[PDB]
Amino acid sequence: FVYVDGNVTIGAAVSGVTVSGLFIDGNLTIAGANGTVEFINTTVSTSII
């Protein structure tokens, strides 16, 4: 179990990121990204944007 209190954003021109096994208690913005991303076993309390 893991709990996060905040928002997570993929910055402009980012690539190669990977996330797993987190409970994100906030939005998840994806702007200016360059692809090559992968999310697994994650939860979001609000709207991805």
Place this chain on the structure above:
Amino acid sequence: ALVSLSTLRGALGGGSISGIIPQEVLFDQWRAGGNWEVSQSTQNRTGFIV
């Protein structure tokens, strides 16, 4: 600048609505009997009406 007029509604006079102009006369003589034909020249000419 951006434009969409230059599309199919481009600067042309509107599509290609053009028919050979009823231009001047060239020859008119009638013949009976066997098959008959005449010839003309393309020099300085780009169309004809028959």
Place this chain on the structure above:
Amino acid sequence: GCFDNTSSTITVQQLVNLVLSQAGGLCDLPQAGGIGDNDLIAGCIGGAE
């Protein structure tokens, strides 16, 4: 810089990306009227602008 009302530092890589990522685009260009072969249209010729 003064990021997040906080005195901290960022990598130049990030600053470069931020500027370019916000560098605008052709979408904001204006819509014009008259045109002619006198004027010119942007495009890629043999791999070059």
